Amino acid sequence: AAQKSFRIKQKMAKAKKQNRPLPQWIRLRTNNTIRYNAKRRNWRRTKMNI
Amino acid sequence: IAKTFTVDVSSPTENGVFDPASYAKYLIDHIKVEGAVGNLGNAVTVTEDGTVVTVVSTAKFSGKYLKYLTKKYLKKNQLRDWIRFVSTKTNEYRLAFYQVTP
Amino acid sequence: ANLRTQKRLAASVVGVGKRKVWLDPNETSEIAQANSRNAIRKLVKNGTIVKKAVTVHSKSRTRAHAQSKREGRHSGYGKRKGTREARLPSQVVWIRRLRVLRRLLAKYRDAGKIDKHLYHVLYKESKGNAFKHKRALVEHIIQAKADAQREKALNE
Amino acid sequence: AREITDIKQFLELTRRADVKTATVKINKKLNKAGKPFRQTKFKVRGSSSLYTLVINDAGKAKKLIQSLPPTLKVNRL
Amino acid sequence: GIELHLPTGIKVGHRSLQRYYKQDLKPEVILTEGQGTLVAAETRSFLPAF
RNA sequence: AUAUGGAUUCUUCACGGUAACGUAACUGAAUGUGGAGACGUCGGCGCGAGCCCUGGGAGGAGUUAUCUUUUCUUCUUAACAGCUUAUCACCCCGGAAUUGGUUUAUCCGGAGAUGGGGUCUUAUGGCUGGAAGAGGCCAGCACCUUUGCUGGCUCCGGUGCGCUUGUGACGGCCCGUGAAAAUCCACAGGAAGGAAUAGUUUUCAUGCCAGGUCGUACUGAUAACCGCAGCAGGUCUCCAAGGUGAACAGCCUCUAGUUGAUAGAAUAAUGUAGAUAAGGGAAGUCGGCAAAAUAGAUCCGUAACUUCGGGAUAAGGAUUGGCUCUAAGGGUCGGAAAAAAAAAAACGAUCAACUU
RNA sequence: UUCAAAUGAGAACUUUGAAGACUGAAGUGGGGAAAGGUUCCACGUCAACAGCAGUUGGACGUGGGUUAGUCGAUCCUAAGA
Ligand SMILES: [Mg+2]
Ligand SMILES: [Mg+2]
Ligand SMILES: [Mg+2]
Ligand SMILES: [Mg+2]
Ligand SMILES: [Mg+2]
Ligand SMILES: [Mg+2]
Ligand SMILES: [Mg+2]
Ligand SMILES: [Mg+2]
Ligand SMILES: [Mg+2]
Ligand SMILES: [Mg+2]
Ligand SMILES: [Mg+2]
Ligand SMILES: [Mg+2]
Ligand SMILES: [Mg+2]
Ligand SMILES: [Mg+2]
Ligand SMILES: [Mg+2]
Ligand SMILES: [Mg+2]
Ligand SMILES: [Mg+2]
Ligand SMILES: [Mg+2]
Ligand SMILES: [Mg+2]
Ligand SMILES: [Mg+2]
Ligand SMILES: [Mg+2]
Ligand SMILES: [Mg+2]
Ligand SMILES: [Mg+2]
Ligand SMILES: [Mg+2]
Ligand SMILES: [Mg+2]
Ligand SMILES: [Mg+2]
Ligand SMILES: [Mg+2]
Ligand SMILES: [Mg+2]
Ligand SMILES: [Mg+2]
Ligand SMILES: [Mg+2]
Ligand SMILES: [Mg+2]
Ligand SMILES: [Mg+2]
Ligand SMILES: [Mg+2]
Ligand SMILES: [Mg+2]
Ligand SMILES: [Mg+2]
Ligand SMILES: [Mg+2]
Ligand SMILES: [Mg+2]
Ligand SMILES: [Mg+2]
Ligand SMILES: [Mg+2]
Ligand SMILES: [Mg+2]
Ligand SMILES: [Mg+2]
Ligand SMILES: [Mg+2]
Ligand SMILES: [Mg+2]
Ligand SMILES: [Mg+2]
Ligand SMILES: [Mg+2]
Ligand SMILES: [Mg+2]
């Protein structure tokens, strides 16, 4: 868009931090079931719909 | 209204590759004044002392023209590629070598 | 040695298209250090990076063709495509002719070469296409002056 | 922005209390007769605008450079 | 065609190379005795971090 | 916010000009009135900007068996400011038929033309400042994680049915006459206000402070968006070089940009796309489907019919290259000692286009 | 499309040089609107992805990047709500 209401750009930020790989020290926590981040999203494949 | 152009032939001459007399003979015969050659009416004079060549001209004439004749005469004698026409100050000109190694 | 970066820079720094840029192929190790717009500027002045010469487009053929053209060279029918009008609009041809006719008629009234009453007629007589070109006008003028002088010498 | 003409009036400006700096620029041009001479522009930065006096005559120029208040900062060239 | 050897014992260049001429290049890397000493003294060989 | 300078006043709120109006200023509440904001579309014409072309000159590159005072390229000047500059319009003198002025386009004049002399808008251009100190072009020096330094040269013109575009005054079109409001200004008004030992003023000059919030990367598509995808589809807009040519058509190049669409080896059938064919010439087929023929310009010639405007490019002919010429068509101007190391002192001229 | 070189375990496909070509100013060029949302840019990287390849990438990993009194929104009204 390049000219965006703050409310929108505010949203995009959140998205940027919801996509990064799982921190590699977490795998060693007792009783941890989590192999990797499944909620990963790629700008090309899935649109956010705002 | 007469302008004075001067070319320095010194460096190639004394190293043996060049003839200020030959070069000056050429300029006189190939210079076009308001028409074909040789027509210099005492409107143009090519004179040479041997370390420098001098065109003195009332007639239409330029640096470009002089560089075009001198860069042409260079080719006749295959001294293109060994020498280049270069301007030191306006109308004060120099024939020099690209890379001189001892 | 991947130079796609430094070639994109040099283009911007030397102020010319990527396609005119030249990277010395023997300095490849050297250039790879560049990485900065500042670095590059050494390399330009240094001489290891260079601006290629604009490829030559000469107009010399066309000059020659337009030169002959204005000797009236190829106007022959076969060389025409558009109609007479499309080449040179009638309206332009007209307008040019009147203007000339009027500037003439103007200059004459103000040199006293003609009186006002006579003028007023050749203005109307002109707008109505009674004169092919500038000479044809001055002829009828000369004939109108020698005309009122054969009415004057026989009124004497 | 503004070119000043009068030199008696320019000299007041030189003080005026708001002018901290100024400069003297030297150009080499040639007159209508095609002869090389020396022109000098006196540039003074007022708060809101720039005043520059032009002197083509070299003499009244060189002496006027002595006519400046010493407190005022001057850049030569 | 590359160079020309003149009677003064002078080699003159060819115009085709014109920008290999105007092109300056790096100087020799010249080590100070401090550095020269150290370099010939150094036995740690580092390719790997894995 | 405010201070200094100016300006005004004992004729309190300035003076000049016959006037159009002028100027560095020159008090002005309530209320009122007027302007701007504020306007279709097309046609040609005038002016400007940029581009295009182009001569002289100062450089750099190229080609040079032969020819080319040659081919290419750099030579640039912002907002803002001062001074000046216009078509239209208006003013004073004057008083026109022998009707005059005038546009390419026929409109104008006793409700005052032509002519003489002025006033304004500043659109636009010009000179100067901004500003050569910047930028660009050449020849040089040193330096390699210092970073720069030094020299020169950046100049003077021309041309136009040219191209985009801005704009002006015009004309045409309509049973169609082609927004609104914020906002700012002027005017009429005379409330109120104030001098002489002093006061008015911030629409004049100068000086002092402050300017918040949110957007700002990149793509904008034969890979950044929608089509389930890195899909021949789809999706609004600005800028726009040379040649040919009527042309923003097609074909070739310059600036910029790509060289990415799985490759290799052979060249059978049938294909898909593109082609050519002797003699005949629609005999083919539901049907001249498909293909071929024609085509530009110039000159000639052009019927029936008709709502008289058309039909019409009707049909039908002839010409078209290259080269050397001939003629015609314009503008401007003139009528303590000894030894060694180390450091320091009706014409005339001239200029220039192409088009027949 | 072609040749060399560098890179590399590995090169029809990456990078540079050379060469040949095309878009041909109604562009395969330079900018933007809607939409996207970090794709921008560097360093490192090649398991999957780029219907061959891959040392390359709009991929993967680690970071960096968007600066306004004047450009917009904000203010005004339109058909309308
Ligand atoms: Mg959803
Ligand atoms: Mg002819
Ligand atoms: Mg035409
Ligand atoms: Mg007509
Ligand atoms: Mg109005
Ligand atoms: Mg101005
Ligand atoms: Mg100037
Ligand atoms: Mg200026
Ligand atoms: Mg400079
Ligand atoms: Mg200039
Ligand atoms: Mg024009
Ligand atoms: Mg347009
Ligand atoms: Mg941007
Ligand atoms: Mg685009
Ligand atoms: Mg597509
Ligand atoms: Mg998609
Ligand atoms: Mg979907
Ligand atoms: Mg266009
Ligand atoms: Mg063209
Ligand atoms: Mg043409
Ligand atoms: Mg064309
Ligand atoms: Mg093509
Ligand atoms: Mg691209
Ligand atoms: Mg590629
Ligand atoms: Mg395919
Ligand atoms: Mg076989
Ligand atoms: Mg046949
Ligand atoms: Mg046959
Ligand atoms: Mg037949
Ligand atoms: Mg049949
Ligand atoms: Mg049959
Ligand atoms: Mg049928
Ligand atoms: Mg058919
Ligand atoms: Mg018929
Ligand atoms: Mg016919
Ligand atoms: Mg013939
Ligand atoms: Mg390929
Ligand atoms: Mg092509
Ligand atoms: Mg962009
Ligand atoms: Mg990238
Ligand atoms: Mg990388
Ligand atoms: Mg694959
Ligand atoms: Mg693979
Ligand atoms: Mg990523
Ligand atoms: Mg500020
Ligand atoms: Mg604004």
PDB file of N, CA and C (backbone and C1' of nucleotides) in Angstrom, chain C residues 17-20 42 55 63 73-74 76 80-81 87 99 103 109 113 117 119 123 127 134-135, chain F residues 45-46 53-54 100 102-103 105-106 147 255-257 296-297 321-322 324 329-331 346 356:
ATOM      1  N   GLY C  17      24.512   3.853 -16.803  1.00  0.00           N
ATOM      2  CA  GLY C  17      23.922   2.526 -16.825  1.00  0.00           C
ATOM      3  C   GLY C  17      24.887   1.393 -16.499  1.00  0.00           C
ATOM      4  N   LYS C  18      24.353   0.322 -15.918  1.00  0.00           N
ATOM      5  CA  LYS C  18      25.099  -0.903 -15.648  1.00  0.00           C
ATOM      6  C   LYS C  18      25.826  -1.419 -16.889  1.00  0.00           C
ATOM      7  N   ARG C  19      25.164  -1.304 -18.032  1.00  0.00           N
ATOM      8  CA  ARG C  19      25.690  -1.825 -19.284  1.00  0.00           C
ATOM      9  C   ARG C  19      26.924  -1.075 -19.805  1.00  0.00           C
ATOM     10  N   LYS C  20      27.170   0.132 -19.307  1.00  0.00           N
ATOM     11  CA  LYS C  20      28.370   0.869 -19.694  1.00  0.00           C
ATOM     12  C   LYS C  20      29.523   0.674 -18.725  1.00  0.00           C
ATOM     13  N   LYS C  42      37.433   5.046  -4.907  1.00  0.00           N
ATOM     14  CA  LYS C  42      38.863   4.871  -5.093  1.00  0.00           C
ATOM     15  C   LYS C  42      39.049   4.166  -6.412  1.00  0.00           C
ATOM     16  N   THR C  55      28.244   3.675 -27.215  1.00  0.00           N
ATOM     17  CA  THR C  55      28.343   3.114 -28.561  1.00  0.00           C
ATOM     18  C   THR C  55      27.896   4.152 -29.574  1.00  0.00           C
ATOM     19  N   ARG C  63      22.452  13.243 -42.604  1.00  0.00           N
ATOM     20  CA  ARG C  63      22.918  14.572 -42.989  1.00  0.00           C
ATOM     21  C   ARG C  63      23.079  14.610 -44.489  1.00  0.00           C
ATOM     22  N   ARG C  73      16.271  16.475 -54.188  1.00  0.00           N
ATOM     23  CA  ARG C  73      16.650  15.203 -54.782  1.00  0.00           C
ATOM     24  C   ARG C  73      15.490  14.246 -54.994  1.00  0.00           C
ATOM     25  N   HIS C  74      14.986  13.609 -53.945  1.00  0.00           N
ATOM     26  CA  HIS C  74      13.917  12.672 -54.229  1.00  0.00           C
ATOM     27  C   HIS C  74      12.586  13.172 -53.734  1.00  0.00           C
ATOM     28  N   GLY C  76      10.186  12.728 -56.194  1.00  0.00           N
ATOM     29  CA  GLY C  76       9.428  12.126 -57.275  1.00  0.00           C
ATOM     30  C   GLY C  76       8.189  11.461 -56.724  1.00  0.00           C
ATOM     31  N   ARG C  80       6.488   9.631 -52.425  1.00  0.00           N
ATOM     32  CA  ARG C  80       5.444  10.242 -51.609  1.00  0.00           C
ATOM     33  C   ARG C  80       4.483   9.183 -51.074  1.00  0.00           C
ATOM     34  N   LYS C  81       3.909   9.424 -49.907  1.00  0.00           N
ATOM     35  CA  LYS C  81       2.973   8.474 -49.319  1.00  0.00           C
ATOM     36  C   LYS C  81       1.656   9.142 -48.961  1.00  0.00           C
ATOM     37  N   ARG C  87       1.164  16.237 -46.517  1.00  0.00           N
ATOM     38  CA  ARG C  87       2.538  16.746 -46.529  1.00  0.00           C
ATOM     39  C   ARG C  87       2.552  18.188 -46.029  1.00  0.00           C
ATOM     40  N   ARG C  99      -0.560  36.606 -44.891  1.00  0.00           N
ATOM     41  CA  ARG C  99       0.303  37.342 -43.971  1.00  0.00           C
ATOM     42  C   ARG C  99       1.316  38.165 -44.741  1.00  0.00           C
ATOM     43  N   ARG C 103       1.478  42.198 -44.651  1.00  0.00           N
ATOM     44  CA  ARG C 103       2.664  42.922 -44.225  1.00  0.00           C
ATOM     45  C   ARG C 103       3.160  43.816 -45.347  1.00  0.00           C
ATOM     46  N   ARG C 109       1.214  51.359 -46.984  1.00  0.00           N
ATOM     47  CA  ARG C 109       0.354  52.439 -46.533  1.00  0.00           C
ATOM     48  C   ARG C 109       1.129  53.405 -45.641  1.00  0.00           C
ATOM     49  N   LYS C 113       3.339  55.020 -49.981  1.00  0.00           N
ATOM     50  CA  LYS C 113       3.385  54.475 -51.331  1.00  0.00           C
ATOM     51  C   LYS C 113       1.988  54.309 -51.898  1.00  0.00           C
ATOM     52  N   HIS C 117      -7.632  54.924 -49.210  1.00  0.00           N
ATOM     53  CA  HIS C 117      -8.773  54.427 -49.999  1.00  0.00           C
ATOM     54  C   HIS C 117      -8.391  53.288 -50.922  1.00  0.00           C
ATOM     55  N   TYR C 119      -5.621  51.382 -50.490  1.00  0.00           N
ATOM     56  CA  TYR C 119      -5.269  50.304 -49.576  1.00  0.00           C
ATOM     57  C   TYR C 119      -6.482  49.467 -49.251  1.00  0.00           C
ATOM     58  N   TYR C 123      -6.888  45.281 -49.647  1.00  0.00           N
ATOM     59  CA  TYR C 123      -7.034  44.448 -48.480  1.00  0.00           C
ATOM     60  C   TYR C 123      -8.166  43.480 -48.709  1.00  0.00           C
ATOM     61  N   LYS C 127      -7.861  39.373 -49.581  1.00  0.00           N
ATOM     62  CA  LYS C 127      -8.508  38.339 -48.781  1.00  0.00           C
ATOM     63  C   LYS C 127      -9.332  37.434 -49.685  1.00  0.00           C
ATOM     64  N   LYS C 134       3.404  37.441 -53.855  1.00  0.00           N
ATOM     65  CA  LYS C 134       3.737  38.814 -53.503  1.00  0.00           C
ATOM     66  C   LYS C 134       4.030  39.704 -54.695  1.00  0.00           C
ATOM     67  N   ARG C 135       4.622  39.138 -55.739  1.00  0.00           N
ATOM     68  CA  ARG C 135       4.955  39.944 -56.903  1.00  0.00           C
ATOM     69  C   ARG C 135       3.699  40.354 -57.668  1.00  0.00           C
TER      70      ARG C 135
ATOM     71  P     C F  45      -2.912  26.249 -37.115  1.00  0.00           P
ATOM     72  O5'   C F  45      -2.839  27.709 -36.498  1.00  0.00           O
ATOM     73  C5'   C F  45      -2.813  28.819 -37.368  1.00  0.00           C
ATOM     74  C4'   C F  45      -3.104  30.100 -36.646  1.00  0.00           C
ATOM     75  C3'   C F  45      -2.035  30.581 -35.690  1.00  0.00           C
ATOM     76  O3'   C F  45      -0.931  31.190 -36.341  1.00  0.00           O
ATOM     77  C1'   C F  45      -4.127  30.742 -34.648  1.00  0.00           C
ATOM     78  P     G F  46       0.571  30.854 -35.868  1.00  0.00           P
ATOM     79  O5'   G F  46       0.805  31.828 -34.629  1.00  0.00           O
ATOM     80  C5'   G F  46       0.709  33.230 -34.807  1.00  0.00           C
ATOM     81  C4'   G F  46       0.625  33.963 -33.496  1.00  0.00           C
ATOM     82  C3'   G F  46       1.736  33.691 -32.502  1.00  0.00           C
ATOM     83  O3'   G F  46       2.947  34.367 -32.811  1.00  0.00           O
ATOM     84  C1'   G F  46      -0.340  33.660 -31.389  1.00  0.00           C
ATOM     85  P     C F  53      19.107  15.736 -32.339  1.00  0.00           P
ATOM     86  O5'   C F  53      19.305  16.729 -33.567  1.00  0.00           O
ATOM     87  C5'   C F  53      18.844  16.355 -34.853  1.00  0.00           C
ATOM     88  C4'   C F  53      18.595  17.544 -35.739  1.00  0.00           C
ATOM     89  C3'   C F  53      19.811  18.360 -36.122  1.00  0.00           C
ATOM     90  O3'   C F  53      20.590  17.746 -37.132  1.00  0.00           O
ATOM     91  C1'   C F  53      18.036  19.808 -35.541  1.00  0.00           C
ATOM     92  P     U F  54      22.185  17.683 -36.965  1.00  0.00           P
ATOM     93  O5'   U F  54      22.624  19.200 -37.163  1.00  0.00           O
ATOM     94  C5'   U F  54      22.085  19.970 -38.228  1.00  0.00           C
ATOM     95  C4'   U F  54      22.424  21.432 -38.086  1.00  0.00           C
ATOM     96  C3'   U F  54      23.826  21.764 -37.607  1.00  0.00           C
ATOM     97  O3'   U F  54      24.817  21.631 -38.609  1.00  0.00           O
ATOM     98  C1'   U F  54      22.273  23.119 -36.469  1.00  0.00           C
ATOM     99  P     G F 100     -12.723  53.924 -47.561  1.00  0.00           P
ATOM    100  O5'   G F 100     -12.269  53.816 -46.034  1.00  0.00           O
ATOM    101  C5'   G F 100     -10.980  54.241 -45.614  1.00  0.00           C
ATOM    102  C4'   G F 100     -10.859  54.221 -44.112  1.00  0.00           C
ATOM    103  C3'   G F 100     -10.112  53.038 -43.516  1.00  0.00           C
ATOM    104  O3'   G F 100      -8.717  53.276 -43.481  1.00  0.00           O
ATOM    105  C1'   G F 100     -12.138  53.409 -42.330  1.00  0.00           C
ATOM    106  P     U F 102      -4.894  48.184 -40.059  1.00  0.00           P
ATOM    107  O5'   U F 102      -5.568  46.805 -39.631  1.00  0.00           O
ATOM    108  C5'   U F 102      -5.506  46.356 -38.283  1.00  0.00           C
ATOM    109  C4'   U F 102      -6.457  45.212 -38.034  1.00  0.00           C
ATOM    110  C3'   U F 102      -6.286  43.993 -38.922  1.00  0.00           C
ATOM    111  O3'   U F 102      -5.223  43.154 -38.507  1.00  0.00           O
ATOM    112  C1'   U F 102      -8.561  44.571 -38.841  1.00  0.00           C
ATOM    113  P     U F 103      -4.493  42.179 -39.554  1.00  0.00           P
ATOM    114  O5'   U F 103      -4.795  40.742 -38.960  1.00  0.00           O
ATOM    115  C5'   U F 103      -5.110  40.595 -37.587  1.00  0.00           C
ATOM    116  C4'   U F 103      -6.001  39.405 -37.366  1.00  0.00           C
ATOM    117  C3'   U F 103      -5.885  38.283 -38.381  1.00  0.00           C
ATOM    118  O3'   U F 103      -4.726  37.482 -38.201  1.00  0.00           O
ATOM    119  C1'   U F 103      -8.165  38.684 -37.861  1.00  0.00           C
ATOM    120  P     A F 105      -8.919  36.181 -42.574  1.00  0.00           P
ATOM    121  O5'   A F 105      -9.858  35.157 -41.815  1.00  0.00           O
ATOM    122  C5'   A F 105     -10.527  34.139 -42.527  1.00  0.00           C
ATOM    123  C4'   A F 105     -11.455  33.385 -41.617  1.00  0.00           C
ATOM    124  C3'   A F 105     -12.441  34.229 -40.822  1.00  0.00           C
ATOM    125  O3'   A F 105     -13.619  34.506 -41.563  1.00  0.00           O
ATOM    126  C1'   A F 105     -11.352  32.698 -39.384  1.00  0.00           C
ATOM    127  P     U F 106     -14.017  36.011 -41.945  1.00  0.00           P
ATOM    128  O5'   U F 106     -14.264  36.715 -40.540  1.00  0.00           O
ATOM    129  C5'   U F 106     -15.455  36.464 -39.801  1.00  0.00           C
ATOM    130  C4'   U F 106     -16.231  37.738 -39.577  1.00  0.00           C
ATOM    131  C3'   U F 106     -17.391  37.977 -40.559  1.00  0.00           C
ATOM    132  O3'   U F 106     -18.483  38.675 -39.936  1.00  0.00           O
ATOM    133  C1'   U F 106     -15.907  39.788 -40.641  1.00  0.00           C
ATOM    134  P     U F 147      41.119  10.316   5.746  1.00  0.00           P
ATOM    135  O5'   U F 147      40.801  11.704   5.029  1.00  0.00           O
ATOM    136  C5'   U F 147      41.750  12.310   4.161  1.00  0.00           C
ATOM    137  C4'   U F 147      41.366  12.178   2.707  1.00  0.00           C
ATOM    138  C3'   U F 147      40.720  10.851   2.302  1.00  0.00           C
ATOM    139  O3'   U F 147      39.847  11.060   1.183  1.00  0.00           O
ATOM    140  C1'   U F 147      42.785  11.102   1.174  1.00  0.00           C
ATOM    141  P     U F 255      23.849   3.580 -26.390  1.00  0.00           P
ATOM    142  O5'   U F 255      22.971   4.507 -25.438  1.00  0.00           O
ATOM    143  C5'   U F 255      23.515   5.659 -24.802  1.00  0.00           C
ATOM    144  C4'   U F 255      22.512   6.260 -23.852  1.00  0.00           C
ATOM    145  C3'   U F 255      22.111   5.365 -22.691  1.00  0.00           C
ATOM    146  O3'   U F 255      23.003   5.455 -21.602  1.00  0.00           O
ATOM    147  C1'   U F 255      20.167   6.224 -23.731  1.00  0.00           C
ATOM    148  P     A F 256      23.426   4.120 -20.825  1.00  0.00           P
ATOM    149  O5'   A F 256      22.052   3.543 -20.260  1.00  0.00           O
ATOM    150  C5'   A F 256      21.578   3.901 -18.968  1.00  0.00           C
ATOM    151  C4'   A F 256      20.222   3.299 -18.693  1.00  0.00           C
ATOM    152  C3'   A F 256      20.180   1.787 -18.501  1.00  0.00           C
ATOM    153  O3'   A F 256      20.487   1.400 -17.168  1.00  0.00           O
ATOM    154  C1'   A F 256      18.513   2.430 -20.044  1.00  0.00           C
ATOM    155  P     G F 257      21.077  -0.066 -16.847  1.00  0.00           P
ATOM    156  O5'   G F 257      20.014  -1.050 -17.495  1.00  0.00           O
ATOM    157  C5'   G F 257      18.676  -1.024 -17.037  1.00  0.00           C
ATOM    158  C4'   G F 257      17.841  -2.103 -17.657  1.00  0.00           C
ATOM    159  C3'   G F 257      18.438  -3.492 -17.659  1.00  0.00           C
ATOM    160  O3'   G F 257      18.284  -4.125 -16.400  1.00  0.00           O
ATOM    161  C1'   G F 257      17.464  -3.021 -19.760  1.00  0.00           C
ATOM    162  P     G F 296      -4.947   2.822 -52.310  1.00  0.00           P
ATOM    163  O5'   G F 296      -3.656   3.616 -51.806  1.00  0.00           O
ATOM    164  C5'   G F 296      -3.374   3.766 -50.421  1.00  0.00           C
ATOM    165  C4'   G F 296      -1.973   4.286 -50.177  1.00  0.00           C
ATOM    166  C3'   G F 296      -1.607   5.604 -50.834  1.00  0.00           C
ATOM    167  O3'   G F 296      -2.117   6.716 -50.122  1.00  0.00           O
ATOM    168  C1'   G F 296       0.159   4.063 -51.134  1.00  0.00           C
ATOM    169  P     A F 297      -3.363   7.546 -50.696  1.00  0.00           P
ATOM    170  O5'   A F 297      -2.683   8.621 -51.663  1.00  0.00           O
ATOM    171  C5'   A F 297      -1.888   9.680 -51.137  1.00  0.00           C
ATOM    172  C4'   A F 297      -0.748  10.043 -52.057  1.00  0.00           C
ATOM    173  C3'   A F 297      -1.126  10.668 -53.386  1.00  0.00           C
ATOM    174  O3'   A F 297      -1.314  12.063 -53.261  1.00  0.00           O
ATOM    175  C1'   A F 297       0.446   8.944 -53.736  1.00  0.00           C
ATOM    176  P     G F 321      10.035   8.454 -59.085  1.00  0.00           P
ATOM    177  O5'   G F 321      11.109   7.292 -58.883  1.00  0.00           O
ATOM    178  C5'   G F 321      11.305   6.671 -57.617  1.00  0.00           C
ATOM    179  C4'   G F 321      12.509   5.745 -57.610  1.00  0.00           C
ATOM    180  C3'   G F 321      13.869   6.419 -57.607  1.00  0.00           C
ATOM    181  O3'   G F 321      14.249   6.864 -56.317  1.00  0.00           O
ATOM    182  C1'   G F 321      13.860   4.749 -59.259  1.00  0.00           C
ATOM    183  P     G F 322      14.912   8.316 -56.133  1.00  0.00           P
ATOM    184  O5'   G F 322      16.289   8.204 -56.941  1.00  0.00           O
ATOM    185  C5'   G F 322      17.254   7.215 -56.585  1.00  0.00           C
ATOM    186  C4'   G F 322      18.419   7.131 -57.550  1.00  0.00           C
ATOM    187  C3'   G F 322      19.121   8.431 -57.901  1.00  0.00           C
ATOM    188  O3'   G F 322      20.025   8.854 -56.901  1.00  0.00           O
ATOM    189  C1'   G F 322      18.734   7.218 -59.865  1.00  0.00           C
ATOM    190  P     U F 324      23.532  14.773 -58.956  1.00  0.00           P
ATOM    191  O5'   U F 324      23.391  15.896 -60.076  1.00  0.00           O
ATOM    192  C5'   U F 324      24.474  16.164 -60.947  1.00  0.00           C
ATOM    193  C4'   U F 324      24.010  16.653 -62.289  1.00  0.00           C
ATOM    194  C3'   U F 324      23.344  18.015 -62.322  1.00  0.00           C
ATOM    195  O3'   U F 324      24.274  19.086 -62.278  1.00  0.00           O
ATOM    196  C1'   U F 324      22.128  16.491 -63.657  1.00  0.00           C
ATOM    197  P     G F 329       8.551  34.055 -57.625  1.00  0.00           P
ATOM    198  O5'   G F 329       7.941  33.477 -56.268  1.00  0.00           O
ATOM    199  C5'   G F 329       6.533  33.376 -56.094  1.00  0.00           C
ATOM    200  C4'   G F 329       6.152  32.359 -55.043  1.00  0.00           C
ATOM    201  C3'   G F 329       6.616  32.641 -53.622  1.00  0.00           C
ATOM    202  O3'   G F 329       5.788  33.583 -52.951  1.00  0.00           O
ATOM    203  C1'   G F 329       7.008  30.365 -54.157  1.00  0.00           C
ATOM    204  P     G F 330       6.364  35.012 -52.483  1.00  0.00           P
ATOM    205  O5'   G F 330       6.864  34.783 -50.991  1.00  0.00           O
ATOM    206  C5'   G F 330       7.406  35.859 -50.245  1.00  0.00           C
ATOM    207  C4'   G F 330       7.990  35.385 -48.942  1.00  0.00           C
ATOM    208  C3'   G F 330       8.708  36.440 -48.117  1.00  0.00           C
ATOM    209  O3'   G F 330       7.831  37.262 -47.368  1.00  0.00           O
ATOM    210  C1'   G F 330      10.070  34.534 -48.271  1.00  0.00           C
ATOM    211  P     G F 331       8.235  38.785 -47.054  1.00  0.00           P
ATOM    212  O5'   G F 331       9.255  38.666 -45.840  1.00  0.00           O
ATOM    213  C5'   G F 331       8.869  38.056 -44.618  1.00  0.00           C
ATOM    214  C4'   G F 331      10.032  37.988 -43.666  1.00  0.00           C
ATOM    215  C3'   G F 331      10.723  39.312 -43.386  1.00  0.00           C
ATOM    216  O3'   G F 331      10.067  40.080 -42.393  1.00  0.00           O
ATOM    217  C1'   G F 331      12.347  37.688 -43.921  1.00  0.00           C
ATOM    218  P     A F 346       7.376  51.217 -62.521  1.00  0.00           P
ATOM    219  O5'   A F 346       7.672  49.654 -62.426  1.00  0.00           O
ATOM    220  C5'   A F 346       7.983  49.041 -61.182  1.00  0.00           C
ATOM    221  C4'   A F 346       9.419  49.294 -60.795  1.00  0.00           C
ATOM    222  C3'   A F 346      10.053  48.306 -59.829  1.00  0.00           C
ATOM    223  O3'   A F 346      10.468  47.096 -60.446  1.00  0.00           O
ATOM    224  C1'   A F 346      10.623  50.524 -59.204  1.00  0.00           C
ATOM    225  P     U F 356       5.986  18.195 -52.180  1.00  0.00           P
ATOM    226  O5'   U F 356       5.627  18.954 -53.539  1.00  0.00           O
ATOM    227  C5'   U F 356       4.289  19.329 -53.834  1.00  0.00           C
ATOM    228  C4'   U F 356       4.204  20.474 -54.823  1.00  0.00           C
ATOM    229  C3'   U F 356       4.543  20.175 -56.271  1.00  0.00           C
ATOM    230  O3'   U F 356       3.540  19.450 -56.955  1.00  0.00           O
ATOM    231  C1'   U F 356       5.478  22.248 -55.656  1.00  0.00           C
TER     232        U F 356
END
